[PDB]
């Protein structure tokens, strides 16, 4: 295919041409497609000539180690291909400690556990209303009818943005994680910034109680945050709010629809939902970004060159059979659910608490109202791969007679 010429410093035996935006075994499921990187024929650290050429760490050990060592593995250029990585200037993700710290503190403020706790009632409220509205229909297009509106509307409420702007923003955020080829990466990013700029200016002058007002008027390093810094942070918040939980919920529901035994498990033993959420986060992990080498560095017997990009798939740690036995099997009773679904190191996800709350609320409220459901007959669910992977469509069906109006 479109393979870049092999750099002189890369041993031929370490080459494995994996395409993160279109993996070969995608039809088997996106996580399954990525897991081919963990078969016996693939070394721990390999070089793919796809997408401009870059390294890929395939084991949890290397992924965790790399995410911790920011001195060698910089977040300055975190996305593949390099073009995207270089245009990517979100805050604080494109920064390494110490610089990142002050901005991350501010981000924790607007999406951290305290915010989640205060927002739980709205989360509960929306989940219940959306699910009840669908219950009597006996069918739904999950991605469009719940997966997107639920987490996204909660985020828009948090950020104090009009739901009317969702379609526009959602299209843009997805061009940065799973480009469909209709927009260049930098242009999609700028479009996001063009939208935010006037809003940030407005909320710095006349601050509201929303997350954007909080960010735009925050302080970093003992001084006021700049309009541009606030912009670069809010841009990141939009992506996290619009293209993370949204995708994960579909992977989870697709699975539950296909496994009555697991649904039954959660209906008969509700207290197991939190554990189930965690196991699902491992099995259907969906993120994969990376870092750039700050200098020549030998890593686990492999010579890495300054400038080289290395993909450190957050998705792979939990699927690594070295971290979890029978990794592709969902066991809600797994004693130790090991994963790096929310990242690792200084950039570990601050919105993970909001994510878990939304997932757990979704599982409890959906199963209590629509306990029995399955994939629409004749439907063949397909996935999409990228920085954040997802489910293209998920047609679900159930018998309204077996549902319960709460
Ligand atoms: C299932 C849901 C989610 C997953 C799997 C996820 C995953 C991740 C991962 C892997 C990282 C680290 C990436 C890196 O090291 O380069 C991260 C960072 C981040 N996430 Fe999440 N995330 C989720 C939901 C959210 C939500 C809902 C928000 C908030 C709107 C959010 C906001 C952020 C921010 C601000 C960062 C950057 C933190 C920093 O750079 O210090 N995330 N997330
Ligand atoms: C890799 C991510 C999941 C993380 C939050 C949104 C995302 C796409 C980023 O750009 C940082
Ligand atoms: K950059």
């Amino acid at each position: 295919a479109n393979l870049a010429p092999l750099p002189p410093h890369v041993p031929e035996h370490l080459v494995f041409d994996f395409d993160m935006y279109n993996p070969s075994n995608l039809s088997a499921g996106v996580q399954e497609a990525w897991a081919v990187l963990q078969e016996s024929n693939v070394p721990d650290l390999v070089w793919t000539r796809c997408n401009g050429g870059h390294w890929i760490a395939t084991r949890g050990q290397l992924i965790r180690e790399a995410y911790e060592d920011y001195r060698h593995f910089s977040s300055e250029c975190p996305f593949i291909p390099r073009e995207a990585g270089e245009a990517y200037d979100f805050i604080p993700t494109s920064m390494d400690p110490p610089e990142q710290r002050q901005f991350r503190a501010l981000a924790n403020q607007v999406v951290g556990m305290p915010v989640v706790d205060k927002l739980e009632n709205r989360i509960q409220e929306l989940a219940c209303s959306l699910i009840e509205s669908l219950r009597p229909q006996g069918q739904c297009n999950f991605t469009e009818d719940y997966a997107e509106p639920f987490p996204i509307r909660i985020f828009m409420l948090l950020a104090g943005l009009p739901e009317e702007d969702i379609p526009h923003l959602k299209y843009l955020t997805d061009q940065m994680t799973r480009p469909d080829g209709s927009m260049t990466f930098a242009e999609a990013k700028e479009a996001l910034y063009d939208y935010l700029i006037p809003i940030i200016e407005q909320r710095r002058q006349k601050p509201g109680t929303d997350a954007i007002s909080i960010v735009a008027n925050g302080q970093v390093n003992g001084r006021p945050i700049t309009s541009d810094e606030a912009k670069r942070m809010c841009g990141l918040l939009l992506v996290g709010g619009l293209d993370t939980v949204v995708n994960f919920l579909s992977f989870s529901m697709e699975f539950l629809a296909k496994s009555p035994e697991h649904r039954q498990e959660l209906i008969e033993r509700p207290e197991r939902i939190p554990a189930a959420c965690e196991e699902l986060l491992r099995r259907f992990s969906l993120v994969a970004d990376g870092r750039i080498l700050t200098s020549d560095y030998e890593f686990h017997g492999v010579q890495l060159k300054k400038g080289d990009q290395i993909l450190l798939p957050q998705m792979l740690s939990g699927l690594d059979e070295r971290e979890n036995a029978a990794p592709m099997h969902v066991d809600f009773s797994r004693q130790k659910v090991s994963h790096t679904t929310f990242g690792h190191g200084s950039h570990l996800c601050p919105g993970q608490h909001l994510a878990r709350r939304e997932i757990i609320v979704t599982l409890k409220e959906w199963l209590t109202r629509i306990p029995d459901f399955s994939i629409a007959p004749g439907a063949q669910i397909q996935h999409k791969s990228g920085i954040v992977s997802g489910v293209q469509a998920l047609p679900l069906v159930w018998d309204p007679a077996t549902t319960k109006a709460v």
Side-chain angles (χ1 to χ4, degrees):
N2 295 296
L3 307 179
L6 186 64
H9 71 290
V10 183
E12 300 68 20
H13 66 88
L14 293 185
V15 178
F16 189 83
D17 301 311
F18 181 81
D19 180 350
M20 69 171 282
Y21 289 100
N22 187 44
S24 294
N25 192 45
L26 184 54
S27 61
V30 66
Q31 285 77 194
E32 285 81 356
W34 282 72
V36 302
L37 286 165
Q38 288 164 156
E39 280 175 31
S40 66
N41 64 123
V42 191
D44 290 353
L45 182 57
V46 298
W47 171 275
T48 179
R49 294 177 287 183
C50 302
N51 303 115
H54 64 84
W55 296 99
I56 301 178
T58 67
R59 299 292 174 180
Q61 180 188 304
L62 284 58
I63 292 165
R64 292 161 183 289
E65 278 180 42
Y67 275 127
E68 286 178 37
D69 182 13
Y70 55 79
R71 299 185 197 297
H72 290 113
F73 304 108
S74 173
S75 288
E76 218 168 76
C77 188
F79 279 25
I80 291 301
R82 189 179 295 286
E83 307 68 273
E86 287 174 353
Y88 186 105
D89 66 333
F90 285 157
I91 291 174
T93 294
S94 66
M95 304 172 157
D96 296 303
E99 180 174 46
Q100 175 214 178
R101 295 176 187 148
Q102 206 71 171
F103 296 97
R104 179 190 175 77
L106 183 56
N108 278 315
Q109 271 187 55
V110 302
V111 303
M113 188 64 87
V115 173
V116 182
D117 278 351
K118 195 181 189 66
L119 224 53
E120 196 172 313
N121 282 163
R122 301 315 297 288
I123 293 177
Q124 176 75 194
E125 184 196 19
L126 183 53
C128 291
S129 58
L130 286 176
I131 296 175
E132 174 56 22
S133 61
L134 298 172
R135 189 187 57 67
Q137 312 181 322
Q139 65 178 303
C140 79
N141 298 124
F142 195 78
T143 68
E144 188 178 1
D145 301 339
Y146 189 87
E148 294 169 12
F150 176 55
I152 298 175
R153 289 177 188 171
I154 287 307
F155 174 76
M156 297 300 269
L157 268 291
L158 176 57
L161 294 182
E163 276 172 25
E164 176 179 52
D165 303 357
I166 293 176
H168 175 247
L169 298 177
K170 177 53 174 170
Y171 169 78
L172 293 178
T173 62
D174 293 6
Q175 295 314 304
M176 292 183 281
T177 56
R178 299 180 297 287
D180 64 8
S182 67
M183 258 197 109
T184 65
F185 186 88
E187 275 169 39
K189 186 194 73 175
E190 208 64 18
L192 223 64
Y193 285 160
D194 282 342
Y195 168 92
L196 287 173
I197 294 175
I199 299 176
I200 292 178
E201 178 47 37
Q202 180 58 58
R203 301 181 188 183
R204 272 159 72 79
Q205 309 221 301
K206 305 172 182 58
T209 61
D210 65 279
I212 298 183
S213 293
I214 298 297
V215 168
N217 296 95
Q219 288 193 58
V220 293
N221 302 142
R223 53 86 177 174
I225 188 173
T226 67
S227 298
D228 202 70
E229 288 169 350
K231 180 199 64 176
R232 290 163 62 195
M233 197 177 325
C234 290
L236 176 56
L237 295 178
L238 292 187
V239 183
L242 278 51
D243 200 39
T244 59
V245 178
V246 169
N247 297 302
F248 178 77
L249 289 175
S250 290
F251 283 120
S252 292
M253 285 303 287
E254 176 191 2
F255 170 83
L256 290 180
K258 298 177 174 184
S259 183
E261 300 73 7
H262 285 75
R263 301 201 303 273
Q264 210 73 304
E265 180 168 357
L266 299 184
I267 298 171
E268 299 180 357
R269 292 263 55 85
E271 78 284 350
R272 188 173 300 164
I273 289 180
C277 161
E278 205 68 21
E279 170 67 338
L280 293 175
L281 283 165
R282 178 195 69 75
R283 178 62 179 73
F284 301 103
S285 196
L286 68 178
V287 182
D289 73 338
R291 304 289 190 256
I292 188 173
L293 275 293
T294 56
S295 63
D296 292 351
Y297 177 58
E298 182 179 0
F299 189 58
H300 288 263
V302 181
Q303 283 302 305
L304 305 183
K305 191 184 185 64
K306 179 183 181 181
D308 280 359
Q309 294 192 79
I310 181 169
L311 180 67
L312 305 166
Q314 281 88 349
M315 178 199 299
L316 291 183
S317 301
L319 303 181
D320 187 345
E321 110 275 306
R322 297 179 188 172
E323 290 200 8
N324 299 284
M328 305 314 291
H329 167 63
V330 178
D331 179 5
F332 294 159
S333 300
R334 198 178 279 282
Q335 183 60 62
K336 176 185 176 180
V337 184
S338 184
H339 72 71
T340 60
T341 292
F342 291 118
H344 192 68
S346 61
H347 295 278
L348 169 64
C349 191
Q352 69 179 83
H353 307 303
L354 174 59
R356 285 200 184 77
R357 199 65 52 85
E358 294 180 348
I359 296 164
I360 293 169
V361 164
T362 289
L363 294 180
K364 180 62 179 179
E365 302 306 331
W366 186 289
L367 291 178
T368 54
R369 295 183 177 66
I370 307 173
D372 181 57
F373 60 94
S374 56
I375 302 294
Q380 190 185 66
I381 314 302
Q382 67 180 300
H383 297 172
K384 44 191 176 180
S385 186
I387 295 293
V388 176
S389 296
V391 180
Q392 204 54 289
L394 184 55
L396 299 181
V397 294
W398 57 88
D399 179 1
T402 74
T403 69
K404 299 297 190 298
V406 187

